[PDB]
Short mmCIF file of C-alpha atoms and ligand atoms in Angstrom, two decimals:
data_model
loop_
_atom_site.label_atom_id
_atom_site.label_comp_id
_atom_site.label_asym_id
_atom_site.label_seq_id
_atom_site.Cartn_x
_atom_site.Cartn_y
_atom_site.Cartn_z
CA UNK A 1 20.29 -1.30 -5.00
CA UNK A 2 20.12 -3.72 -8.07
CA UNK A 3 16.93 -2.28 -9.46
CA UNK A 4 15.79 -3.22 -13.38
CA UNK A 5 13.29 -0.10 -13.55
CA UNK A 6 13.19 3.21 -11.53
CA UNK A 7 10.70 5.91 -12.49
CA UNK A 8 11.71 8.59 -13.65
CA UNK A 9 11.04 11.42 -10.94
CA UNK A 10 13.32 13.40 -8.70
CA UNK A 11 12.30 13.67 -5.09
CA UNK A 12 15.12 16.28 -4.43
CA UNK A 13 13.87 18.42 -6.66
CA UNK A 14 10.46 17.98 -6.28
CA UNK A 15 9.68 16.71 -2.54
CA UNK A 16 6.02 14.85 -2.78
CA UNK A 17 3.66 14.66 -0.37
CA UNK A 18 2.30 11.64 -1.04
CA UNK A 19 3.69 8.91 -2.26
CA UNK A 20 1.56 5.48 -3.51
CA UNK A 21 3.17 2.27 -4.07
CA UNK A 22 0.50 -0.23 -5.81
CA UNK A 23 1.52 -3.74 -5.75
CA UNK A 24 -0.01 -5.48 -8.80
CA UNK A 25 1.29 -8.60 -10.74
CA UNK A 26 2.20 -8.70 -14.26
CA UNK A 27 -0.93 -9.39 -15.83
CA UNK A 28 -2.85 -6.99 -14.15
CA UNK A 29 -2.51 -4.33 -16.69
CA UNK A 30 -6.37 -3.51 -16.33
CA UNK A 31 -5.72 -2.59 -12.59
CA UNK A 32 -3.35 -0.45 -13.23
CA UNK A 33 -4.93 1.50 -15.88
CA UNK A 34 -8.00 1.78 -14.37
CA UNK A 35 -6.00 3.30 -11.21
CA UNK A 36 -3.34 5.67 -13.74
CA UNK A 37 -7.08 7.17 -15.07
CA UNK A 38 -8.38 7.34 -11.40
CA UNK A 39 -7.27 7.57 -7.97
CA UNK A 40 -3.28 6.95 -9.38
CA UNK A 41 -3.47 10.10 -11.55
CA UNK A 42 -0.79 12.77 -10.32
CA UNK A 43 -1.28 15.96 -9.66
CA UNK A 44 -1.46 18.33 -6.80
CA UNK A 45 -3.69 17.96 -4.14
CA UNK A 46 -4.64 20.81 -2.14
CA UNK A 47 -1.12 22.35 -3.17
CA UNK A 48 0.68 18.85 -2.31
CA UNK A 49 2.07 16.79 -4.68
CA UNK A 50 1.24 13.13 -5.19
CA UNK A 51 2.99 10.48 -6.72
CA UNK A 52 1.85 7.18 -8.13
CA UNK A 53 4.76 3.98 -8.84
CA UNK A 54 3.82 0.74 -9.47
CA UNK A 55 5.71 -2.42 -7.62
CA UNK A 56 6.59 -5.35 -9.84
CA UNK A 57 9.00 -8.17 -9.41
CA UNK A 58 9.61 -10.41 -12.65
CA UNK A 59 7.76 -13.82 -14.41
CA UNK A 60 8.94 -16.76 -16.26
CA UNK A 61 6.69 -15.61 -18.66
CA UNK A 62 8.47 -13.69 -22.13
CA UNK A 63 4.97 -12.24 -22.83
CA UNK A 64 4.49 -10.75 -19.49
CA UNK A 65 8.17 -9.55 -19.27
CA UNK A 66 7.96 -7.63 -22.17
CA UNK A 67 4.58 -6.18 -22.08
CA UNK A 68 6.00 -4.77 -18.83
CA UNK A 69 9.17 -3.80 -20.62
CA UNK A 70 6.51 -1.78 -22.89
CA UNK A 71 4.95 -0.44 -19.89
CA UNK A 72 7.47 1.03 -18.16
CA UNK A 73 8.81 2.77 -21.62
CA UNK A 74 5.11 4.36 -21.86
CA UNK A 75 4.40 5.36 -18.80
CA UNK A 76 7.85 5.32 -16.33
CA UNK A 77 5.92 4.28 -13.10
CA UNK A 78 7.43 1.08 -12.68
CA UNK A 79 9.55 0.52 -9.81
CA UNK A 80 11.11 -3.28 -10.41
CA UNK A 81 13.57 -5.93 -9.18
CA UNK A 82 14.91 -9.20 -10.01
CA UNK A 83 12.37 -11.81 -7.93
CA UNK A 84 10.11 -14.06 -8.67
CA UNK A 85 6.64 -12.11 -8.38
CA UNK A 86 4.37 -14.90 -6.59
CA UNK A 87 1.94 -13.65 -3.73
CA UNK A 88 4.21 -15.40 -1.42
CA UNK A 89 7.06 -13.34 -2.84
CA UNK A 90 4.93 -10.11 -1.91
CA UNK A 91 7.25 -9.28 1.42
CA UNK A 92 9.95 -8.45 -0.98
CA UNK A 93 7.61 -6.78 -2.83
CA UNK A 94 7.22 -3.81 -0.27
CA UNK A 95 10.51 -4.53 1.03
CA UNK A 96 11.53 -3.23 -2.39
CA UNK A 97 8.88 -0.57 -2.08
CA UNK A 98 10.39 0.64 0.83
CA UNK A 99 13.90 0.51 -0.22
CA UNK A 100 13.17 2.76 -3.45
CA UNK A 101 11.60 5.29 -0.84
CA UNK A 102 14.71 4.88 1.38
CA UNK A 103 17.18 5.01 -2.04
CA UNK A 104 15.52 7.55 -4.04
CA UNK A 105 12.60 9.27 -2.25
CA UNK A 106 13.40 9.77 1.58
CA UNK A 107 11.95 13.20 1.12
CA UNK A 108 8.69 12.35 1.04
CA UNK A 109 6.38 13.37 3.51
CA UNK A 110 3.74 10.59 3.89
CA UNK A 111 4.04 6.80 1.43
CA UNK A 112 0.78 4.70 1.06
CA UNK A 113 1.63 0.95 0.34
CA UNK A 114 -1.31 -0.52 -1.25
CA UNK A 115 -3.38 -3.05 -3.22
CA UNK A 116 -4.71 -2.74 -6.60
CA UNK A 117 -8.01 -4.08 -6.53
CA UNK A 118 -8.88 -0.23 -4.01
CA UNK A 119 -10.29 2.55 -4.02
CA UNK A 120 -8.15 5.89 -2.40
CA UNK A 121 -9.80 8.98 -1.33
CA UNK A 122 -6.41 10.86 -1.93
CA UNK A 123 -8.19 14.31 -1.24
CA UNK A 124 -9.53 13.09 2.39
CA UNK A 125 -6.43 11.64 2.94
CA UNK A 126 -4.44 14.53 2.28
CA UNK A 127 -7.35 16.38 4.56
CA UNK A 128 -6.37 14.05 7.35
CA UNK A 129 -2.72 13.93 7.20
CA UNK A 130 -2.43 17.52 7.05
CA UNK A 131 -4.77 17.54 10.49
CA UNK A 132 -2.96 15.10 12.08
CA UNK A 133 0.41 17.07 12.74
CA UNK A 134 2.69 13.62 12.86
CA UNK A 135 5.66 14.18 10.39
CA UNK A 136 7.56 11.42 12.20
CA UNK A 137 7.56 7.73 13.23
CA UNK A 138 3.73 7.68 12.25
CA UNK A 139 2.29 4.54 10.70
CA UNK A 140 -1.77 4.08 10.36
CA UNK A 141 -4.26 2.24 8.50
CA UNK A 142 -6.78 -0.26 9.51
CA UNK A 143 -4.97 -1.57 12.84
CA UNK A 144 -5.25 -5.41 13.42
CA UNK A 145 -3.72 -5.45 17.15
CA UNK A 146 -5.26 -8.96 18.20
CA UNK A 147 -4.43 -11.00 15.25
CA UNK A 148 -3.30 -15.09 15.56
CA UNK A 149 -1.43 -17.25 13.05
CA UNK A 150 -4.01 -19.01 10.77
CA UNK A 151 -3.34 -22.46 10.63
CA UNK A 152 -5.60 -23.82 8.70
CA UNK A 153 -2.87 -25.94 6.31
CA UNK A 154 -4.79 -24.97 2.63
CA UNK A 155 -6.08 -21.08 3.82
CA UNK A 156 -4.15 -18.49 1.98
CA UNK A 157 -2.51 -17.18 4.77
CA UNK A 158 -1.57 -20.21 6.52
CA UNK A 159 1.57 -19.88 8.11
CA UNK A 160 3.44 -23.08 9.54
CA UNK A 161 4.56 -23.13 13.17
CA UNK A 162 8.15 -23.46 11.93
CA UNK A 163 7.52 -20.29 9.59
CA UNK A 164 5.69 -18.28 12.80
CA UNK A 165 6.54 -20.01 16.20
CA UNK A 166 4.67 -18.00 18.27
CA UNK A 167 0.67 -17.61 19.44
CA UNK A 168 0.35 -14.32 18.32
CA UNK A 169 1.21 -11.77 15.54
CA UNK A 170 2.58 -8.10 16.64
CA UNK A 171 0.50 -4.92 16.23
CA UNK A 172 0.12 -4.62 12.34
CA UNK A 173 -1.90 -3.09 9.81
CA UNK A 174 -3.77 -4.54 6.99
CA UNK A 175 -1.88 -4.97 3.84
CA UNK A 176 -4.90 -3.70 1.68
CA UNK A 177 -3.35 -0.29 2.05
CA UNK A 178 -1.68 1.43 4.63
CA UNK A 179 0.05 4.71 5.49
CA UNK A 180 3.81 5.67 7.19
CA UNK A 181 5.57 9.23 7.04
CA UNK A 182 8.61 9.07 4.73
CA UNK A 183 11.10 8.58 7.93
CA UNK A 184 9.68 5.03 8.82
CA UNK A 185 11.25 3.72 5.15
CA UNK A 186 14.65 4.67 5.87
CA UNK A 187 14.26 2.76 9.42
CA UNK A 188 12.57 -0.31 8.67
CA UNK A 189 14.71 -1.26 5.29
CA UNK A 190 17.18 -0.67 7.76
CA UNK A 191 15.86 -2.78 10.42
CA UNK A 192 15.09 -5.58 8.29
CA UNK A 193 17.49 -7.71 7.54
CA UNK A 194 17.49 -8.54 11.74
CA UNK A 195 14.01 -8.94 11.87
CA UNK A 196 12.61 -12.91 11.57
CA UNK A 197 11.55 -13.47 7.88
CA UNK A 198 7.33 -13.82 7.49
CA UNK A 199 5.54 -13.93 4.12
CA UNK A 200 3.01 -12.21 4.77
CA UNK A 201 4.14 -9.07 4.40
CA UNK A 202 2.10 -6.80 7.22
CA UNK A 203 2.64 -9.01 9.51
CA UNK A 204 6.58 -8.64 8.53
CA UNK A 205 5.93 -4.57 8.36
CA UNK A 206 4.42 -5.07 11.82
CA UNK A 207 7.90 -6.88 13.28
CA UNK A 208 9.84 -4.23 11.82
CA UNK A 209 7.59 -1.74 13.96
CA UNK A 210 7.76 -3.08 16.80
CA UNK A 211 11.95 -3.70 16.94
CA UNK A 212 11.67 -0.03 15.95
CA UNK A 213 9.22 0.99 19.25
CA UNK A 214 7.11 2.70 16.24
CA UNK A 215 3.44 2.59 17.60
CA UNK A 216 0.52 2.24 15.33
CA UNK A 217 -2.49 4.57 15.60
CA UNK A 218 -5.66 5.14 14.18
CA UNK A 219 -5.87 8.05 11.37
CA UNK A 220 -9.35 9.58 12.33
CA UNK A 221 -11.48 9.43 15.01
CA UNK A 222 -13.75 7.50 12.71
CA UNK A 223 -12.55 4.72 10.97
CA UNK A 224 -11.29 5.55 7.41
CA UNK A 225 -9.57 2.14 6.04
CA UNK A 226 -12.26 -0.67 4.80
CA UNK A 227 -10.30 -4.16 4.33
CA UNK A 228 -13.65 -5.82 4.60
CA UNK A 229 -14.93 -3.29 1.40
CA UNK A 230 -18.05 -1.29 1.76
CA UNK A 231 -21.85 -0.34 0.78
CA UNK A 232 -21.08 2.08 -2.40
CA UNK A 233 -23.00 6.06 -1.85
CA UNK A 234 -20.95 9.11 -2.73
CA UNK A 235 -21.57 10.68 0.45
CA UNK A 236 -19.56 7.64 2.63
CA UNK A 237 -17.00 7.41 -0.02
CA UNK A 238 -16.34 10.98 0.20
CA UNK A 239 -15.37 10.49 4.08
CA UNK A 240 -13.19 7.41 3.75
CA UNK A 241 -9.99 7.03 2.44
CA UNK A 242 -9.71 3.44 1.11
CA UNK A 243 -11.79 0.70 0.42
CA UNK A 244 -10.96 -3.20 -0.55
CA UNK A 245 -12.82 -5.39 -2.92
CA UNK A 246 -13.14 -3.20 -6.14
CA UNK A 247 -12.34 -4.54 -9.32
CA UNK A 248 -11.21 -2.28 -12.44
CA UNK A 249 -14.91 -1.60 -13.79
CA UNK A 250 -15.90 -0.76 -10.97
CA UNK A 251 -13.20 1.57 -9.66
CA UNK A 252 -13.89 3.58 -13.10
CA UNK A 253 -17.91 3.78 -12.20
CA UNK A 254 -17.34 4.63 -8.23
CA UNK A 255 -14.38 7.47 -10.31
CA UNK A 256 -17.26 8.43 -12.63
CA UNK A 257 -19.71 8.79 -9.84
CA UNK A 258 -17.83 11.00 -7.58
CA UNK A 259 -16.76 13.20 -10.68
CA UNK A 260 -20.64 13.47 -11.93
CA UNK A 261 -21.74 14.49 -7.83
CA UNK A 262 -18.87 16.83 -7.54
CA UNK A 263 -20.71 19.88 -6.32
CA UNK A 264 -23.22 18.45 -4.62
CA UNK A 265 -23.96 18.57 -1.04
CA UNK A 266 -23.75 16.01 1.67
CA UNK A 267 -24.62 16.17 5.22
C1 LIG B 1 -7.75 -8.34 4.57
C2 LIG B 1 -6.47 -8.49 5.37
O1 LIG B 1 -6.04 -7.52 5.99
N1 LIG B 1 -5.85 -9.67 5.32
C3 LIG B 1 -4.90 -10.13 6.34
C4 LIG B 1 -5.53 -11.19 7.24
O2 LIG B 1 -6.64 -10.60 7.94
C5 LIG B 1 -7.67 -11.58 8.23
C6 LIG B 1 -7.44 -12.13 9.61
O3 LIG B 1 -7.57 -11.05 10.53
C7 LIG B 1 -8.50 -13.15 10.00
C8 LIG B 1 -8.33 -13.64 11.40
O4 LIG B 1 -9.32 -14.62 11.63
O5 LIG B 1 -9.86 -12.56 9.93
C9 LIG B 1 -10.12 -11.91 8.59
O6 LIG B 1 -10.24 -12.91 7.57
C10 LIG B 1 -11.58 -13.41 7.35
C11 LIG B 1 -11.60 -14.90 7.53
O7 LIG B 1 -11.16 -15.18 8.88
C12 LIG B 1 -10.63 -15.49 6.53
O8 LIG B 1 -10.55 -16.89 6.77
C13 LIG B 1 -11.02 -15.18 5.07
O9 LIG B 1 -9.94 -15.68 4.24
C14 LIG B 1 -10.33 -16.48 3.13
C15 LIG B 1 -11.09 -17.72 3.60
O10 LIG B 1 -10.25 -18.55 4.39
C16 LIG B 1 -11.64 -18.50 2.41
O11 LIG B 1 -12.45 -19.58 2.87
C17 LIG B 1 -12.45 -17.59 1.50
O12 LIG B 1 -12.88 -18.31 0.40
O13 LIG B 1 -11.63 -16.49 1.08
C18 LIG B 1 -11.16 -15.66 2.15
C19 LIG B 1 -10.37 -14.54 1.50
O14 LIG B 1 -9.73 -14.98 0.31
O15 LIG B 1 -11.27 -13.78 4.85
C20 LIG B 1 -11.98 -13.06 5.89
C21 LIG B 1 -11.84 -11.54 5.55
O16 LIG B 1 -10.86 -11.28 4.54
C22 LIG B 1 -9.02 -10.94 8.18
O17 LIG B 1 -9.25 -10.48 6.84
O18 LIG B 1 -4.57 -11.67 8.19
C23 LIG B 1 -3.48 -12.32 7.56
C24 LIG B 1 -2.60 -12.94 8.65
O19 LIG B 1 -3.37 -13.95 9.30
C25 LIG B 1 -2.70 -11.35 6.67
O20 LIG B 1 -2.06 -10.38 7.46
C26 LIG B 1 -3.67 -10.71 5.66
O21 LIG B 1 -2.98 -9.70 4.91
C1 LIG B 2 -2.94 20.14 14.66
O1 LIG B 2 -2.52 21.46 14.93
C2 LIG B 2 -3.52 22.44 14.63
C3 LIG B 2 -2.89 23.79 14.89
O2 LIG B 2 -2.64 24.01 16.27
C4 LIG B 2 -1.38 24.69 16.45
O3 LIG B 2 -0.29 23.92 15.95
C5 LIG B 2 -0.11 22.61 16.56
C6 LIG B 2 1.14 21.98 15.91
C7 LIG B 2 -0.03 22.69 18.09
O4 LIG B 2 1.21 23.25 18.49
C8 LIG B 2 -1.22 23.53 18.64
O5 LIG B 2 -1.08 23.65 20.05
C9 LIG B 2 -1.26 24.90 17.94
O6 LIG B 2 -2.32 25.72 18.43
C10 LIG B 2 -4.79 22.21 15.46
O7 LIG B 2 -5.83 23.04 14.96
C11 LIG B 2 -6.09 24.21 15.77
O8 LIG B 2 -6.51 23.85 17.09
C12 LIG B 2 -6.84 24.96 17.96
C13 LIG B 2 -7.38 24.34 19.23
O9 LIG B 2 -8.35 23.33 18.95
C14 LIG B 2 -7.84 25.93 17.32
O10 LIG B 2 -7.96 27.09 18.14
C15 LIG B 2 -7.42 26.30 15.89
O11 LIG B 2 -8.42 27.10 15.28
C16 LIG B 2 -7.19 25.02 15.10
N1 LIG B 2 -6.96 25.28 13.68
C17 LIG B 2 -5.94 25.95 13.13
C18 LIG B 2 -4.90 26.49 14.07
O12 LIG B 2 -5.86 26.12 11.92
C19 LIG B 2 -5.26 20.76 15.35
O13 LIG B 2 -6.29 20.51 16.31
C20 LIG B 2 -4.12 19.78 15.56
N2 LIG B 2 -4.56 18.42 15.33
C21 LIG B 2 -4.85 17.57 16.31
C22 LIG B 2 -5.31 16.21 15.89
O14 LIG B 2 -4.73 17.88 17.50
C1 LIG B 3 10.76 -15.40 -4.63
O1 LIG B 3 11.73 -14.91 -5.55
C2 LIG B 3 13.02 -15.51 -5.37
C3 LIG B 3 13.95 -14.78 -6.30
O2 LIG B 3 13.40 -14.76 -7.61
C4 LIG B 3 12.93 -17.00 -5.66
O3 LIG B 3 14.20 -17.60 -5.40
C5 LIG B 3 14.79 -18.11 -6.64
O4 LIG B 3 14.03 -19.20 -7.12
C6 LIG B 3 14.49 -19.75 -8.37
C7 LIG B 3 13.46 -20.76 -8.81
O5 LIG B 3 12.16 -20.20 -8.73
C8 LIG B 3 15.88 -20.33 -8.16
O6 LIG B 3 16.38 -20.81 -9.41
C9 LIG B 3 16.81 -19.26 -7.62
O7 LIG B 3 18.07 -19.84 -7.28
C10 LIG B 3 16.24 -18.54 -6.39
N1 LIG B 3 17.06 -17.37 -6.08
C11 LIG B 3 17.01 -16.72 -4.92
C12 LIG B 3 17.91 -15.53 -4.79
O8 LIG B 3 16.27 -17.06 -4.01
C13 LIG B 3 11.88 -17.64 -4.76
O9 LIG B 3 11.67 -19.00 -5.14
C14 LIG B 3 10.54 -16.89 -4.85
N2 LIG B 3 9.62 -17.42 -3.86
C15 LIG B 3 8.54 -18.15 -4.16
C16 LIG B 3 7.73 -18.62 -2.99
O10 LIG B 3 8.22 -18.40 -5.31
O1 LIG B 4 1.85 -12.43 -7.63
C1 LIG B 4 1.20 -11.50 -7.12
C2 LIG B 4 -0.07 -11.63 -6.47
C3 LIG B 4 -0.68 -10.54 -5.97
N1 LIG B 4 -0.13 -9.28 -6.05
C4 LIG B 4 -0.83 -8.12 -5.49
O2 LIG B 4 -0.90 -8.29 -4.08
C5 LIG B 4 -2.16 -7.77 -3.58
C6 LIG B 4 -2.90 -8.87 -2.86
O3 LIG B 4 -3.43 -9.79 -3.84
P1 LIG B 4 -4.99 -10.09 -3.92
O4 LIG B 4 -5.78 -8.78 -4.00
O5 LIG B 4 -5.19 -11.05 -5.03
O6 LIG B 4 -5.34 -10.77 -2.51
P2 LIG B 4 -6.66 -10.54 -1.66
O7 LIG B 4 -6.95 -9.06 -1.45
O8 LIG B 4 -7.73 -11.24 -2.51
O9 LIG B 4 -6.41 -11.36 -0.39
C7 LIG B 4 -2.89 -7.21 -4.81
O10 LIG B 4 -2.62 -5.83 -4.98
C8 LIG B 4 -2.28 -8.02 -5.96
O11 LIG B 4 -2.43 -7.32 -7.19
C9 LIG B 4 1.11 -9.07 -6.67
O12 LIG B 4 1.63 -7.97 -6.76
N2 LIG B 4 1.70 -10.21 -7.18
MN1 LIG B 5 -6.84 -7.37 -2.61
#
């Protein structure tokens, strides 16, 4: 479907459990090492596999175009198309994301769409998705089911009454990072092109949902996704499974902290 990089990895083959999709722009080459050395790293988790691709549109910029180039030749975790990658561009960001999972992974069993500047507690996620016995039509994260247009004209999510008509958004989750079994892909890229365009792309996700009758619900019985980022201690982070607001230095230290207290008791 017109892609310019696809990572090299076979779904059929290997079926994974989890698949992340990190949106990140060009530049942010620190984010995404700092997440390839930490939560991104693949391997298997509690006998599941995870997966780690990284979305990217394309830049103006020769520089930035081929240090990605470069990129994708060392490492083969780039999943790209041809648009202009801008954060108001970022619905066709995980509309992309979603396609390659509809193309080229549909068997996987759970995909996380998320932000770079997180922290993922893949193990207690894993933990909780193997508890929760949905394998179908199941989308979760940190539910926002009471949200209203912002229309403040010069906030960053400021959407126009022309661009969103109506008083209120549909059930969505947060884009920070959010969690659908493999089946929801196939339906929503196919849902989509019906579905009124929005720029911000959970509230778009959230549209797609809803024409779908796809009803959100909460992961845990305590809440597990932190949009509004969180107190650092070992002990919390080991019971959540993301957090927003963590830069690269500080994703390595939290990494480096939970590594040096593995073994250690909790409760
Ligand atoms: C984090 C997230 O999920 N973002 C989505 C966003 O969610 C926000 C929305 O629910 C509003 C509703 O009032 O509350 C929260 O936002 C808080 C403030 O209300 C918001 O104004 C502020 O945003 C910026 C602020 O305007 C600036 O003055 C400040 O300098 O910087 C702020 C951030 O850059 O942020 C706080 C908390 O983030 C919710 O976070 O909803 C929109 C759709 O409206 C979209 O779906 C986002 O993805
Ligand atoms: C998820 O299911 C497990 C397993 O329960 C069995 O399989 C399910 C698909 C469903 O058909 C159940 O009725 C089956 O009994 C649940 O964990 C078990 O729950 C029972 C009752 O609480 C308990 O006796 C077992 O020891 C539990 N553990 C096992 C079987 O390993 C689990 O509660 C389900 N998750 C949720 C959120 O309900
Ligand atoms: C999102 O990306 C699309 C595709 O790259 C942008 O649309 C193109 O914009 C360029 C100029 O930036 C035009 O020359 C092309 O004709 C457009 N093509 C298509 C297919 O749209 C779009 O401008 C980007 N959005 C934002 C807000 O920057
Ligand atoms: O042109 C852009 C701008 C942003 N992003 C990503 O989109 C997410 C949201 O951006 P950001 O974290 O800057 O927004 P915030 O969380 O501050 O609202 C992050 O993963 C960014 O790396 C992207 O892929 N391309
Ligand atoms: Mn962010």
């Amino acid at each position: 479907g017109n892609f310019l990089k696809l990572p090299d990895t076979d779904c059929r083959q290997t079926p994974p459990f989890l698949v992340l999709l990190v949106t990140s722009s060009h530049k942010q080459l620190a984010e995404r090492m700092a997440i390839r050395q930490t939560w991104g790293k693949e391997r298997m988790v509690k006998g599941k596999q995870l997966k780690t691709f990284f979305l990217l549109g394309t830049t103006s910029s020769a520089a930035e175009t081929k240090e990605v180039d470069q990129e994708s030749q060392r490492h083969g975790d780039i999943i790209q198309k041809d648009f202009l990658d801008v954060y108001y561009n970022l619905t066709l960001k995980t509309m992309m994301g979603i396609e390659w999972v509809h193309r080229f992974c549909p068997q996987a069993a759970f995909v996380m769409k998320t932000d770079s500047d997180m922290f993922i507690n893949v193990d207690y996620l894993t933990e909780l998705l193997l508890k929760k016995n949905r394998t179908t039509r199941f989308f979760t994260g940190f539910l926002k089911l009471n949200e209203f247009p912002i229309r403040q004209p010069f906030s960053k999510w400021f959407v126009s009454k022309s661009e969103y008509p109506w008083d209120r958004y549909p059930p969505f989750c947060s884009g920070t990072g959010y969690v659908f079994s493999g089946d929801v892909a196939s339906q929503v890229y196919n849902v989509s092109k019906s579905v009124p365009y929005i720029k911000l792309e959970d509230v778009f996700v959230g549209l797609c949902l809803e024409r779908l009758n796809i009803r959100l619900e909460e992961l845990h019985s305590q809440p597990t996704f932190f949009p509004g980022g969180l107190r650092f201690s070992v002990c919390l982070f080991r019971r959540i499974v993301a957090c927003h607001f963590i830069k690269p230095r500080t994703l390595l230290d939290y990494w480096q902290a939970l590594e040096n207290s593995r073994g250690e008791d909790c409760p």
